[PDB]
């Protein structure tokens, strides 16, 4: 079935390039297919001395085929999966009955335990999407043509067309620039974060509220889960995140949420002529009656020509037209006021004209579907009426609140700028003592702080004026304001107070991010001091919530010193929480890499410690995640389905908590595999030296992916980038060796309680089980190549003691698991691309290879290269493509 | 499998009004079975008692039932038939395989004669849609939901929610008001007209176009039909044709105009971003570089915020997106230009800025389509470039072109308002030769003709000021004025000069109707006497449309010799223009009745006399019919299928023409026939008496379907509707009798000459086989009822002379086709209203049963009923559903 594509492709790729192209691309592949079968070292330099011939822009056009190949590959397998699994006629259905039969819960248990259930997914700009927008649409249509190519029910021309389109969007693809050539705008961020509403999440919500209330028929509860029970709900940093992004100005944020606003009134309006269409009933209840009778007083009999439909004044005849044609008209002067407000920098739109409350626009909605079911409609009301209430109770004015994010120096800077101005002191130089009960006496202080003479540096003006436009827009436009390198409570509460004295209306909820192990170590402690703060606890409402960083963790230490550290961190949080009575929510900054906190969803759920979440789950969906779980109708529901499932099963069927024994197992393990870690990525004073030489890592910025402009000061995401390009994964698996080794030579009977702990303690299975994973998606042959071509003869052992440990860890992984379906295949391209990866960097770091209109060829579409005409394009393409094929930037 | 839609209805049905009401629906159902099983005429009777007893509301309820029981049976009917017609795995690919392997013709000679065929469907608002419009979009909703479920893929929970959305959807239905409570205005039926647009036409015709490229690709014919090949257009007459019609007003033309363009304009917006994103290519030719370098020079480098996607200004290295970025920006432009134009009475926005051209639109569009195809991208080119290229030349800037129609004396009023005006005698009391050389003499002189103060009554003012509104607005949206009851060329010449002189920058084209059957005697006559004006011919370049009435030629005279009639006029005005060398396109007044010219599209489109179609057809699409024909994907496919080969095969395959006696043998049979249909419905002085008793024509006018305020003075479209609830059909088959009988009394030969007729030529055998087709549609028993309940003892025999007549001319029917699948069920229904139908009737002609705040029961819902509270609304829901089941109104 695979030769399927292979077949199609090169066909193309014939007719595009010639038949040599394609030979060479086949010879390619067959070496390849060579080396990930029998494994022989020498295929790949055999493979090199073929690749060395190339032309400069033949080889563009080989990286260019292997990437699209890498990126179909993916496609079919995408389809393949939602083939295999809709033939079938965890999961939803299955987890309500292992519920059930399991652990003997009722069915109402699942009910009300599924009504106070809420999953926070914040989607964010992290610069992982390795694609280019352009080419992601292409994805789609090609995976939709397979899609309906794989079914039984295709009619003769149904299927010449669907030929004829599958190539011609293949070759559209094909003819598409691949290469950022200029690095996007936040709001370019926030605009390819939205386009998956308009898109897929807009019709996804309501589907999936439909099956999970199918589910719910299944156990026997007729009852339909509320319309404004918040099952799920969208956060976005697109535009807001500024933590070191100096290009997301106040503006910025300004112009994304009347952006999103605009969005939203847009999709309503579309929606309502259709369900006022529908909304024919002529029965209603005596509240309804009354209501329509007074829209229908002020019904303003007027033409109201711009409409399309029910243009004319609306009857009593059918009053749930009457009250939606009001809702109409508030929709029309919202989407209208936002757009003059996007388009100029004003609207002479009266606000009152418009929605303005989060539910000015429910009401209306509610009170119909009260009359329906007060008149035995209520199977009409579940239909588009309950679809639309679940979308406005789940999308609100704009499509998602945004979360506001930046450092606690920032603040700090801002802060020693006030009492500096004030000749009272420097905030910076007092003691976090003084910060405390300074910011308390001002807190709960009535006298305006600054005025209009204070002195701004660009970056004071910048955090004050992002809080200006944070008070002059609509409170139901933001999430939370969320404080990177939180050490003490005087970082939260100089957020409140610049919130108060910035005449913020409505304050936002301030959360703090503990990113840095010592920070995770430290945070109990620190958030527990802040609890104790009698006005800030008293202001906090009985709810809180708290970040917890997963990217920069497991880069300073080991990343299974980074695992156990947030396993107890969680631990010890809600403790906290309980303690103080206030209901904790944790915010999980998870990447889509392992090396970065990631995983498969239900897994990294089930890994947390039990306890933890009831009914409040909060996590970051990292740019190139977002295309992984909602470019499809079923993308999207089967992410909705994963995540809500591992919650409500985290919830009712907490995981075992651990014994005593295997806690101090994992405090030891912990000290041996840090010092393994550290020994290797610090102590050793060349390894620097050779990371900057054996992976691609300085060359990441030239893909163009994000708007933001030693091996301690590198950023998470090109750190695991670099080592999962080469296949190696270092950062995944390190400790890991020296860990075991220690622990089994301390006590023997310790290989025993290490073969309890994976079969019992849900964690640290998760934890060996992906590591298997990882190794199973490395070869060490490739950093063996890499070494071979770019380090220097010196310190050549270094990386071969490195793959030692690799190979001796791998031993010991499996070793706790107790192990010894055939798709293959696809590793054959990555090999190739390896290759093409390798010899490039190598011509790229040469002096003769250096510099010292239209295009029409390849070769032309890279002019300010400050490297040779073909190579600097070729390096992109194979990142690229390597991405893809691994399924994993970073 | 019928029996699944009766289960789930009289489920609700029960859940609705109780078991009572179920059991005495079935009641009915039972009985209607035994009377269209048996045909005991007693069975009526047994019915009607059963009626009787009913309380007045349960009435209504029991005639919503079988009401929406037959509008259920034709969906189910439509599906069915989709289905039947889909597992087959006239039609398109059989006529070319036809037209290859039967007459010998070349696929290029099908190809170059499809290039140069045009079919100009026109939808008119003629008040025959019985359904409101607020039922249909639910009727649209069920037939999806009974098109999902008629499949063998259903996932057990996709089962379920569809159980519970046709449930949900047809108790919506139910609880809706069937009865429009007031009639619409012009713009609310066009309204109704271009909501089949936005709906199914707008994504139709490419799919079909699409269809059409495959056939032709199965022929050998690689090459795809021109985008600009003008295939199929679309006409409309709602909100412009004013033919005793004094609600259309001129405000009202303009009104319905700005209305289309902003629609247009509306959906090439939402249409031209997605596109902008696919058209990402780089390689292009240096006629599209220069372009894409002249746009980006005055690129504007602004924000442009107000756009969602490609906000920023958009860079060379994507060229088509350029250039379809400035159609973008123009296309906003106009789209907001129409929207304040229409809001307002004005806009601020410069024409400048928007599409003026019908194709300044479409240039830039073909400069992409060239680049494609210089770069090898032909495939790319034919995808959604190619659609969009076609939507463009098909719809253009107002989706359908207006036609406005009046008739010739509002003219003549003008005019000798204007010669009494200009004190130079009375344009009515002149002879026509006096008119036309006045007439030409101003035609072709250059002086203003009336001034500012000329006197106008409201009438007057009424036709000039539609002329001043067409020249006011563009061009491109209107298409021809159609001039009722034309006798002479100065009622053509008349509407030409008084487009001039009302300044219409490009006057539209003149064209006539012949309607009575004097005037279609007469038209080829007249029309030769208009070529022979060597001014007008000179004017008309060669090209023109005359219209030819359906509707009132069988009216006044025989069906027969009306049809006949037909195709002599058609014949001779294709003579007329041969000889004075203009191409001629006849416009052809059908209905969707057979009494008013109805029938299959193909049949009647064979019965049309060979070579004079030739590659231009114009047709009406009576109300009703629309819904009928584009309600659905495949309806709108199959019907663009079926008008397009019915054209192409009567342009290749000619029909026979026929020999001279079948002429002679017509025109005495016309003459007897016509005798035999005057006989009856205008010699008889009782005729019309009897007609407003046994026939339900006049209370016609509660349906309140269109905006319009002895027999010969009534429409006939009631007059054909009146006859068709009775089923029995009399303006269909009346002549038929005589004509036969007296021709085989003639001659004994003449039946082996009948015999030979009905099996050679075309439209002699499209006759009989539809006047077959409408007896089996006809019961006499139910005209037989009508008259025992409501018509004076005195003429009773009356009607039976017509059963006479009725069963004789059946006999002769079959007698010239050789006759002598198993549906029948629905008549059950239908007999059932029949009955309801009748007795109800006799209650509301009485004086004990006429008439001498909220609604929360249907008896509430017509408190100004001139009758009883029950009765109107109870017949009213007899000829909704009588006519939803024999699937015509009139």
């Not at 610049?498 to 005449?503: D, T, W």
């Not at 809600?574 to 995983?599: C, D, I, P, Q, W």
């Not at 977002?626 to 079923?634: L, R, V």
Request: net charge negative; proline share 5%; glycine share 6%.
């Amino acid at each position: 079935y695979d030769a399927l594509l292979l077949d199609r492709f090169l066909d193309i790729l014939q007719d595009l390039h010639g038949e040599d192209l394609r030979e060479t691309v086949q010879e390619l592949y067959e070496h390849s297919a060579e080396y990930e079968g029998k494994h022989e070292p020498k295929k790949l330099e055999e493979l090199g001395s073929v690749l060395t011939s190339l032309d400069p822009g033949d080889s563009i056009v080989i990286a260019k085929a292997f990437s699209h190949m890498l990126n179909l590959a993916n496609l079919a397998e995408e389809v393949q999966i939602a083939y295999r699994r809709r033939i079938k006629k965890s999961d939803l259905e299955e987890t309500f009955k292992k519920l059930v039969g399991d652990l003997n819960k009722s069915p109402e248990e699942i009910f009300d335990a599924l009504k106070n259930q809420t999953v926070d997914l914040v989607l964010t700009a992290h610069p992982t999407q390795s694609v280019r927008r352009s080419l992601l649409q292409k994805h789609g249509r090609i995976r939709d043509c397979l899609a309906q190519l794989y079914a039984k029910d295709i009619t003769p021309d149904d299927k010449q067309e669907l030929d004829e389109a599958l190539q011609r969007e293949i070759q559209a693809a094909f003819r598409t620039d691949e290469i950022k050539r200029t690095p996007p705008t936040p709001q370019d961020e926030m605009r390819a974060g939205m386009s998956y509403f308009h898109e897929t999440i807009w019709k996804g919500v309501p589907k999936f509220l439909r099956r999970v209330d199918t589910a719910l028929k299944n156990i026997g509860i007729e009852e339909r889960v509320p319309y404004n029970a918040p099952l799920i709900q969208f956060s976005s940093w697109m535009g807001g995140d500024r933590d070191g992004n100096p290009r997301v100005t106040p503006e910025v944020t300004r112009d994304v949420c009347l952006l999103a606003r605009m969005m939203a009134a847009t999709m309503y309006f579309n929606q309502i002529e259709d369900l006022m269409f529908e909304m024919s009933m002529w029965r209603c209840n005596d509240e309804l009656r009354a209501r329509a009778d007074e829209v229908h007083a002020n019904s303003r009999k007027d033409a109201a020509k711009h409409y399309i439909e029910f243009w004319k004044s609306i009857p009593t005849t059918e009053p749930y037209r009457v009250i939606l044609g009001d809702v109409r008209d508030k929709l029309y002067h919202t989407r209208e006021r936002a757009h003059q407000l996007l388009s100029n920098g004003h609207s002479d739109v009266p606000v009152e004209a418009t929605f303005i409350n989060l539910e000015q626009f429910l009401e209306p909605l509610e009170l119909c579907y009260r009359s329906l079911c007060s008149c035995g409609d209520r199977p009409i009301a579940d239909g588009s009426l309950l679809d639309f209430l679940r979308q406005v109770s789940t999308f609100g004015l704009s499509l998602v609140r945004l979360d506001i994010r930046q450092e606690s120096d920032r603040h700090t800077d801002v802060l020693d700028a006030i009492t500096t101005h004030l000749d009272i002191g420097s905030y910076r130089e007092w003691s976090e003592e003084r910060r405390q009960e300074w910011l308390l006496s001002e807190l709960s202080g009535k006298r305006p702080l600054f005025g209009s003479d204070l002195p701004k540096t660009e970056e004071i003006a910048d955090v004050l004026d992002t809080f200006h436009v944070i008070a002059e827009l609509p409170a139901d436009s933001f999430g939370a304001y969320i404080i990177s390198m939180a050490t003490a409570p005087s970082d939260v509460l100089a957020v409140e107070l610049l919130q108060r004295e910035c005449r913020v209306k409505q304050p936002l909820r301030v959360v703090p991010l503990f990113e840095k192990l010592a920070d995770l170590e430290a945070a109990p402690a620190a958030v527990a001091r802040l609890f104790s703060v009698d006005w800030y606890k008293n202001r906090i409402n009985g709810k809180q919530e708290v970040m917890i960083g997963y990217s920069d963790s497991g880069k300073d230490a080991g990343r299974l010193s980074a695992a156990w550290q947030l396993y107890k961190a969680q631990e010890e949080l809600v403790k906290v929480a309980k303690e103080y009575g206030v209901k904790l929510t944790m915010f999980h900054g998870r990447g889509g890499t392992v090396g970065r906190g990631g995983g498969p969803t239900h897994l990294v759920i089930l890994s947390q410690p039990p306890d933890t979440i009831n009914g409040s789950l909060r996590v970051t969906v990292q740019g190139e995640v977002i295309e992984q779980s909602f470019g499809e109708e079923h993308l999207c529901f089967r992410t909705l389905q994963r995540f809500t499932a591992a919650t409500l099963e985290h919830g009712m069927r907490p995981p075992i908590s651990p014994k005593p024994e295997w806690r101090a197992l994992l405090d030891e393990m912990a000290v041996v595999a840090t010092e393994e870690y550290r020994s290797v990525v610090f102590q050793e004073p060349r390894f620097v030296e050779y990371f900057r030489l054996a992976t691609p890592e300085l060359e990441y910025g030239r893909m163009n992916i994000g708007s933001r402009p030693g091996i301690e000061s590198l950023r998470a995401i090109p750190w695991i980038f670099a080592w999962t390009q080469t296949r190696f994964h270092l950062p995944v698996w390190l400790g890991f060796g020296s860990a075991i080794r220690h622990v089994i030579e301390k006590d023997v009977r310790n290989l025993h309680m290490l073969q309890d702990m994976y079969q019992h303690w849900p964690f640290f299975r998760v934890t060996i089980d992906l590591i298997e994973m990882v190794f199973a998606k490395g070869d060490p042959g490739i950093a063996a190549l890499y070494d071979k071509l770019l380090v220097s003869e010196e310190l050549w052992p270094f990386g071969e003691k490195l793959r030692a440990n690799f190979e001796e860890t791998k031993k010991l992984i499996l070793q706790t698991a107790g192990h010894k379906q055939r798709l293959r295949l696809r590793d054959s391209y990555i090999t190739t691309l390896n290759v093409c990866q390798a010899y490039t960097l190598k011509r790229i770091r040469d002096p003769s290879y250096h510099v010292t209109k239209p295009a029409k060829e390849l070769i032309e579409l890279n002019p300010t290269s400050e490297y040779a005409p073909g190579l600097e394009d070729t390096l992109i393409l194979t990142m690229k493509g390597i991405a893809a094929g691994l399924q994993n930037t970073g």
